[PDB]
Design a protein around this nucleic acid. Structure first.
Ligand SMILES: [Mg+2]
Ligand SMILES: [Zn+2]
Ligand SMILES: [Zn+2]
Lengths: 99, 79, 50, 49, 1337
DNA sequence: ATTGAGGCTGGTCATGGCGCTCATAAATCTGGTATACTTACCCACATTGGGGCTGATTCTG
DNA sequence: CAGAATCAGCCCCAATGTGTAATACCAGATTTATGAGCGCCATGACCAGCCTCAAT
């Protein structure tokens, strides 16, 4: 099985399962720990932001690859926004300050 | 070829500043009118920049000086 | 037809495969003898005796 | 399954850990060829349009 | 865009400001065209449009009308993505308490209001009343009244008395409470009262209330009045394919809440009775509690059919929660997986990749290349050409995959080497080929295993994968400095067969001018592969300053070795290929070639070795046959003798001469001896079975058997396997755990029967279950170890410290299990080393000890070098490179920025699945003793009166070879410095009873004892000796409990005997069950017996307990301070431990149990940290009494001993790092000048920097005591609440964070991964440094 | 280097299916009242905290 | 000197927190669908010179 681009889940904009919905492999906590043991900070960032969650990130990267430019923008993952909204639904106030 | 980068790591230490400098040089070659300082043996920009670093004529100081000189020449072109 | 690695027999400790290989080789030798005797088609008493 | 003529020896590392080396005649004689049957269905539903 | 995250509790005003509208109806859709209903959970006018720039009524359907709201329906014309971030609010009709703050493990509201949780729940349940503002009614501010009591109080007084019930009453009390007055009252109570529990409770209350006051929260905000609503899209109602729908449980919970609120409003409007109003309020409270957290307060509410509903807390928590399943790890694109194969033709830096997988992966690159080459006019044309698979797309793919690395990963990632980078090679098929050398690192086989493929996208990722994750760049294991790409089976077998001489062969004694003509003679068939010949060779030596010197000579070698000499790099002697060349020899040769030459020759030599081994193994063609298992001709005779002995033992048991246990022991010993004899005979028969004759009579050499070679080359099999193949397999184990007396006498070559097979099935199933459980335990242990030390990163280069750890070789009382070279190589010395003779200065202080330094130290025979460690590093928030030493994965020193904690945790956790009276000197040496209070007895033996005496054997090199613990009052034959011989007994004692001998001579008299009161008169039936047994406190009466038998040595003049060097009398108070050897009237002598007093889990739960800092079940009592001991009066117990110092006071006292044996005497001086009892030692007490060095040494020693017993080699740097991380917290004793509490527990770095600042200024610092915590406790106690919430106890962490109003700076790795930016460990360290230097400039 | 015609720049006149707006109307959606008598549902560990003792220093009859 | 009271120390009992690799009818009000109609941006058909060539 192999995938480059496909469909994404509804609640969290992430790839689907395996070989049934034409989905991608899963990058787990052990793999994250291995990449942290390595010095591949850029690889980890492009793994957990552009290829998975950043809605504008993935399309921008696709357009840059088609145009021949190997560069990316990190953006912000949708999963963290979903988590923030879920926490704000309780009686807990969490926010990001700019300074 | 570039099987290993031992010579480049000797030239520039810490194995991370090497990565940063090589990425800078490869981006400069890929986007812009920059040209390689070594003969092109049908190699990618990463390999070409690693070979330039191994030869010892490309580093962060040289890149900064070249950027400063280019900026000064662009500013001097106001006629 | 098949080539297998002998390095897996002593660690796994299964001589049954070797015994079955020997038994199959003996049975295939017997079958080859029977087939050659049938191809020569001399008589039926020799086949009966064998 | 099928009965095969096996030999026990290393052959240029092609059976390094557990790999099995197979001759061309096995696939030429179709000794291990299997048939598989799958069913596909097309559903025609009624939409509001 | 941001640098910190702030968490707090939300006020009703802020909640209203968050909401875009109110939700008044529970309707979802209109079941016709599925339009969103008005004022519902999916109201379009509240939560934005449904389609892009489309009005709900259709009036506006163009981008021209963007930004204007419709008048027919009110729906704003904008994007539909605003439905994902818009929230609603619901106006509750009655106040509702928050379930988290009420049912959290500490009752926040209860301990804030000083009310019991039971009482608060009673008031909330509408059961009892509560008084608010009682006034002059003789009623308390928090008194609780029942219905009858409230009625009685209302009857007497109708005014000046207010009583409410429920959340409204709780909110009124919270509003009425005065925080400053409570703080001052509690501080006054703290100052006045003196009690441990009261002080602790008041301190916790004062801390909580001070933090509440500092924060901007208000007490009344804990009771919910307006609650938010989740955006529609996060709880979708999409139509399922088939005309059905799918919904989440939050929709149903919100529906329930809304309906109950509406019913309550209707009942309030209709003036419902009090009972109905209370029932409705209770229903509303229950509904809100179940919405917030289902199953916490009462029984969980069932869902549609059978299962219970899922709440917001349920989504937040659990392994399948957002933090772990969707935020720490995420599915990614550009990935692929398939089955792996060997492909032996590949090189170390390349792998095989199917054409279809690469075509599917590199689709955008192909599209861009096709567009650039002009072959395809449009991207659609390029896609059509790729779908058609023309003849040019393959060329494009070959061009683009020429130099673009990939990532290969196996599904278990135990260590760092689970992901590597390779260079793809296009091949035909559907299977990936993997290099055989990386198979051991990957822990992968070829019996259906699969691997994943990942494509780096950006330039920086490609360069990182090439420079750091390349297979050729990591050949050394991070855990230990040893190679990891060594050949395992086929190459080892081939090289062993090549380099294995024979007695007689073709062309023996031929003189050869070179390996070239040696290979000529081999290939031509004129000579054997291995024949003893003379070959002229040239070798090169690096003895010069970087230059090579060539020398030529004639050597005695074989044709195989001469041929193999071709591939050896021109830097090594010829002696490294002139042996049998097993697997250990191959690994040592590879390591030597690496360390001498470099990297490129190492990989080239490894590839050449693998190629040659494969070729020559295939040329030899070794096989296995039924005749390889050779059965010895004495097995049956040994079996018959064993059976005869068993029958004789059975007859002896039937005669009644022996017991059942003795019979069983004899039978099992006989069977074990027979098994050992059979195994030895078969070893002897198989090992040298090949016998031949050369040009004469006969000669014997090593056997040529195929199985023997397979087992002697270390490729596969072992002695146990050979025993199980060609002999009896020994004794099995019943399910109970014992050993069956009947062993299995049949091997695998013969036919086992049903009984033996059924017996073996038990062991097979036990092994399978143990293997199934070991992985599940090791995963949890590895996760717990990783999560505690994930923030440790090297940040400095040299901290400038002088401390260190004293490193000595490990001696257990015999042969050394850990040479000093292993424990010192790669470390930096803390102090300058001196000469062994203390004459000249040795290697300087701040040097790095490489192999040359280690060889010099070995040659000079240095006893013990001290080195720096990370636990003594002075660097704040990280460690320096010098203290760490060197990374034991590359030759150079450790680089700056490396996250050593992750590597340490991974190295510790990787091998977790592998884990399940007379002294007899060994070798000649000199007897040495340390801390021995010896004296000459009347027999000449050097008796010892000190419990801290260690026996040491020092050879003439000055190295320690033996270490033994000498019991007190033990008989010693030799002395100090006396030369002895091997196998000589020097020390003897009685382990069943310790002596009570005295160090002085004189008379023994009977004073302060009465026959029957304290002692009994008993006559021995056999020996006849008359002795006075001393009864303990429970055996004796109450009158004699205060009169302990006191025996004191008196001289011929009647005075007390003075110990030499002092004048304190030596009186000994014999405890209970003390049999006196000698009676009154008989003179004694020094060193003579006077009285006699009668006296390990497997696996890694020991490792788990050691890492978790669990206290032992029966801790050993230790001495608090040095001084004399003054036994305490029985106080409802055994004894009172009071130790009087030389001049200080002795307020200390301890509760000693009466069932625990004691070692200290009446007049024995104890030292600080000295043992008083026997048993397991507590690590907290060890730390508190002997600093941090002793406890880190103990932990390191224990873990290293366990791993060495299990056979795993791990460097102690990781253990030290884990100990440091576990030793991070510390408490405050007393504050000198900086604001601090008397029992507050804060970070050690904070108090360290505060004390440095105070000492730099004119103020006085404070005092602290280091604290030791478990791994989970240290991980939970973290300055950043995000990391703590990600690990465990998410609800508790979030509650505490909200309450305290904590601010979270990222400042870490896991937090940066969570937020989705560059971690400050690898390449992003410089970016983080630049950001820090730009901020606050 | 002019004066005799074609191609191409300015506007004529409605023209024609489309879309927004008015109005009718039966089907769909809401609220409302019923009077023989019917009365209470239906696994194994590790840790902290609360409540009941257990002495052990203070005071007592 | 023995008594028992009110405090810390100790111990029994409850609680939460962990645990792996890809019914019935009645009446009154509302709304969507077919009724046509005004009105129009844009389809198909002309129709005057300024702009673009030729002979003498
Ligand atoms: Mg396998
Ligand atoms: Zn509208
Ligand atoms: Zn340091």
């Amino acid at each position: 099985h192999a995938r480059s681009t496909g469909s994404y889940s509804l609640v969290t904009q992430q790839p689907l399962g395996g070989k049934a919905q034409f989905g991608g492999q899963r990058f787990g906590e052990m793999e994250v720990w291995a990449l942290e043991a390595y010095g591949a900070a850029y690889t980890l960032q492009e793994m957990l932001t552009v290829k998975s969650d950043d809605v504008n990130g993935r399309t921008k990267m696709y357009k840059n690859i088609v145009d021949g430019n190997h560069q990316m923008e990190p953006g912000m993952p949708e999963s963290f926004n979903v988590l923030l909204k879920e926490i704000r639904s309780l009686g807990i106030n969490i926010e990001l300050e700019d300074e | 070829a570039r099987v290993t980068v031992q010579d480049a790591v000797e030239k520039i230490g810490n194995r991370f500043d090497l990565v940063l400098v090589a990425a800078r040089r490869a981006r400069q070659m890929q986007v812009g009118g920059k040209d390689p300082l070594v003969p092109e043996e049908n190699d990618k920009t990463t390999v070409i920049a690693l070979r330039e670093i191994e030869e010892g004529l490309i580093n962060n100081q040289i890149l900064d000086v070249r950027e400063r000189q280019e900026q000064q020449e662009q500013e001097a072109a106001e006629l | 037809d098949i080539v297998l690695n002998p390095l897996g027999v002593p660690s796994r400790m299964n001589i049954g495969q070797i015994l079955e290989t020997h038994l199959g080789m003996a049975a295939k030798g017997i079958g080859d003898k029977i087939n050659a005797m049938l191809k020569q088609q001399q008589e039926v008493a020799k086949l009966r005796e064998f | 399954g099928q009965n095969m003529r096996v030999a026990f020896m290393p052959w240029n590392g092609y059976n390094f850990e557990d790999s099995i080396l197979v001759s061309e005649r096995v696939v030429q004689e179709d000794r291990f060829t299997t048939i598989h049957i799958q069913e596909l269905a097309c559903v025609s539903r009624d939409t509001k349009l | 865009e941001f640098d910190a995250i702030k968490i707090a509790l939300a006020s009703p005003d802020m909640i209203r400001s968050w909401s875009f509208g109110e939700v008044k109806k529970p309707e979802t859709i209109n079941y016709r065209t599925f339009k969103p209903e008005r004022d519902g959970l999916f109201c379009a006018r509240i939560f934005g449009p449904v389609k892009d720039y489309e009005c709900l009524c259709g009036k506006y359907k163009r981008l021209k009308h963007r930004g204007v709201i419709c008048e027919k329906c009110g729906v704003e014309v904008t994007q539909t993505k605003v439905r994902r971030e818009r929230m609603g609010h619901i106006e509750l009709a009655s106040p509702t308490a928050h379930i988290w703050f009420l049912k959290s493990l500490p009752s926040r509201i209860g301990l804030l209001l000083d009310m019991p949780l039971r009482d608060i729940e009673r008031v909330l349940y509408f059961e009892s009343y509560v008084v608010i503002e009682g006034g002059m009614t003789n009623l308390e501010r928090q008194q609780i009244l029942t219905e009858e009591q409230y009625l009685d109080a209302l009857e007497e007084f109708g005014d000046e008395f207010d009583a409410k019930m429920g959340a409204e009453a709780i909110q009124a009390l919270l509003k009425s409470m005065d925080l400053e007055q409570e703080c001052e009252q509690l501080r006054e109570e703290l100052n006045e009262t003196n009690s441990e529990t009261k002080r602790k409770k008041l301190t916790k209350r004062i801390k909580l209330l001070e933090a509440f006051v500092q924060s901007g929260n208000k007490p009344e905000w804990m009771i919910l009045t307006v609650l938010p609503v989740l955006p529609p899209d996060l709880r979708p109602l999409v139509p399922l394919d088939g005309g059905r729908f799918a919904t989440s449980d939050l929709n149903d919970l919100y529906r329930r809440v809304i309906n109950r609120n509406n019913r309550l409003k209707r009942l309030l409007d209709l003036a419902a009775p009090d009972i109905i109003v209370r029932n409705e309020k209770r229903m509303l409270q229950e509904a809100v509690d179940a919405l917030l957290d289902n199953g916490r307060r009462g029984r969980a509410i069932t869902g549609s059919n059978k299962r219970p509903l899922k709440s917001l807390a349920d989504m937040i928590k659990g392994k399948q929660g957002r933090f772990r399943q969707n935020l720490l790890g995420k599915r990614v694109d550009y990935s692929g997986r398939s089955v792996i194969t060997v492909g032996p033709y590949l090189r170390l830096h390349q792998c095989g990749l199917p054409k279809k997988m690469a075509l599917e992966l590199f689709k955008p690159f192909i599209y861009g290349k096709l567009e650039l080459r002009g072959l395809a006019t449009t991207i659609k044309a390029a896609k059509k050409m790729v779908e058609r698979e023309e003849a040019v797309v393959w060329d494009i793919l070959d061009e683009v995959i020429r130099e673009h690395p990939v990532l290969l990963n196996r599904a278990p990632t135990l260590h760092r080497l689970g992901i590597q980078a390779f260079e793809p090679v296009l091949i035909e098929g559907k299977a990936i080929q993997l290099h055989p050398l990386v198979c051991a690192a990957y822990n992968a086989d070829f019996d259906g295993d699969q691997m994943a493929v990942h494509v780096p996208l950006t330039l920086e990722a490609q360069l990182e994968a090439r420079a750091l994750m390349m297979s050729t760049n990591n050949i050394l294991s991070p855990a230990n400095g040893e190679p990891i790409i060594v050949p395992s089976q086929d190459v080892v077998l081939g090289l062993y067969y090549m380099t294995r001489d024979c007695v007689n062969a073709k062309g023996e004694g031929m003189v050869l001018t070179g390996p070239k003509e040696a290979e000529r003679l081999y290939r031509s068939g004129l000579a054997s592969l291995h024949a003893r010949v003379k070959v002229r060779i040239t070798e090169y030596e690096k003895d010069a300053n970087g230059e090579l010197v060539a020398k030529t000579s004639l050597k005695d070698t074989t044709v195989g070795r001469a041929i193999l000499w071709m591939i050896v790099p021109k830097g090594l002697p010829y002696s490294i290929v002139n042996q049998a060349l097993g697997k250990k020899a191959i690994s040592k040769m590879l390591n030597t070639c690496y360390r001498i030459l470099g990297l490129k020759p190492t990989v080239i030599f490894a590839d050449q070795i693998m190629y040659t081994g494969f070729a020559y193994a295939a040329r030899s063609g070794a096989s296995v046959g039924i005749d390889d298992m050779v059965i010895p001709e004495k097995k049956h005779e040994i079996i018959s003798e064993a059976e005869a002995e068993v029958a004789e033992i059975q007859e002896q048991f039937q005669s009644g001469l022996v017991t059942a246990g003795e019979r069983y022991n004899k039978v099992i010993d006989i069977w074990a001896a027979a098994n050992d004899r059979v195994s030895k005979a078969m070893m002897d028969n198989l090992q040298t079975e090949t016998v031949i004759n050369r040009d004469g009579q006969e000669e014997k050499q090593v056997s040529f058997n195929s199985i023997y070679m397979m087992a002697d080359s270390g490729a596969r099999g072992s002695a146990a396997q050979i025993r199980q193949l060609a002999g009896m397999r020994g004794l099995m184990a019943k399910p109970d755990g014992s050993i069956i007396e009947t062993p299995i006498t049949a091997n695998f070559r013969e036919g086992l029967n049903v009984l033996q097979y059924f017996i073996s099935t038990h062991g097979a199933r036990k092994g399978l279950a143990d293997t199934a459980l070991k992985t599940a335990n090791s995963g949890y242990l590895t996760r717990r170890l990783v999560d505690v030390a994930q923030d440790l990163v090297v940040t400095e280069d040299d901290c400038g410290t002088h401390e260190g750890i004293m490193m000595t070789p490990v001696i257990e009382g015999g042969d050394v299990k850990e040479p000093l070279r292993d424990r010192v190589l790669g470390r930096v010395t803390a102090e300058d080393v001196l000469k062994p003779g203390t004459a000249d200065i040795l290697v300087p202080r701040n040097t790095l000890l490489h192999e040359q330094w280690c060889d010099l130290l070995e040659e000079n025979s240095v006893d013990a070098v001290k080195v720096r460690s990370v636990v003594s590093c002075d660097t704040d928030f990280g460690v320096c490179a010098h203290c760490y030493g060197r990374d034991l994965a590359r030759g150079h020193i450790i680089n700056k920025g490396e996250a050593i904690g992750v590597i340490a945790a991974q190295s510790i956790g990787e091998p977790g699945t592998q884990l399940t009276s007379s002294i007899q000197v060994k070798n000649k040496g000199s007897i040495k003793l340390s801390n021995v209070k010896s004296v000459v007895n009347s027999s000449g033996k050097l008796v010892i009166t000190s419990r801290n005496t260690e026996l040491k054997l020092i050879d003439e090199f000055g190295r320690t070879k033996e270490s033994y613990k000498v019991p007190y009052g033990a008989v010693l034959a030799k002395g100090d410095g006396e030369q002895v011989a091997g196998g000589e007994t020097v020390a003897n004692w009685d382990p069943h009873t310790m002596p009570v001998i005295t160090e002085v001579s004189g008379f023994v008299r009977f004073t302060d004892m009465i026959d029957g009161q304290t002692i009994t008169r008993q006559t021995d039936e056999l020996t006849g000796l008359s002795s006075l047994v001393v009864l303990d406190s429970a055996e004796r009466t109450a009158g004699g409990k205060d009169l302990r038998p006191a025996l004191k040595i008196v001289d011929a003049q009647g005075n007390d005997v003075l110990i030499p060097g002092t004048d304190m009398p030596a009186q000994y108070f014999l405890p209970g069950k003390a049999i006196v050897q000698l009676e009154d009237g008989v003179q004694i002598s020094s060193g003579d017996t006077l009285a006699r007093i009668p006296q390990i889990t497997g696996g890694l739960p020991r490792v788990a307990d050691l890492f978790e800092a669990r206290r032992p079940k029966e801790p050993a009592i230790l001495a608090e301070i040095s001084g004399i001991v003054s036994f305490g009066k029985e106080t409802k117990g055994k004894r009172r431990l009071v130790i009087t110092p030389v001049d200080g006071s002795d307020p200390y006292e301890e509760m000693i149990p009466k069932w625990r044996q004691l070692n200290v005497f009446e007049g024995e001086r104890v030292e600080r940290g000295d043992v008083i009892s026997d048993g397991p030692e507590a690590p907290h007490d060890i730390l508190r009494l002997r600093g941090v060095h002793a406890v880190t040494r103990y932990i390191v020693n224990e873990v290293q001993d366990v791993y060495r017993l299990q056979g795993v080699k791990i460097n102690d740097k990781h253990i030290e790092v884990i100990v440091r991380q576990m030793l991070r917290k510390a408490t405050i004793v007393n504050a000198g000048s900086s604001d601090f509490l008397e029992g507050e527990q804060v970070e050690y770095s904070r108090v360290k920097i505060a004390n440095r600042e105070l000492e730099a200024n004119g103020k006085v610092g404070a005092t602290y005591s280091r604290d030791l915590l478990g791994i989970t406790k240290a991980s939970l106690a973290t300055e950043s609440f995000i990391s703590a919430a990600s690990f465990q106890e998410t609800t508790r962490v979030l509650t505490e964070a909200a309450v305290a109003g904590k601010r979270d700076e990222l400042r870490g790795l896991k937090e940066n991964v969570i937020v989705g930016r560059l971690i400050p460990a690898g390449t992003g360290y410089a970016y983080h440094q630049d950001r820090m230097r730009r901020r606050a400039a």
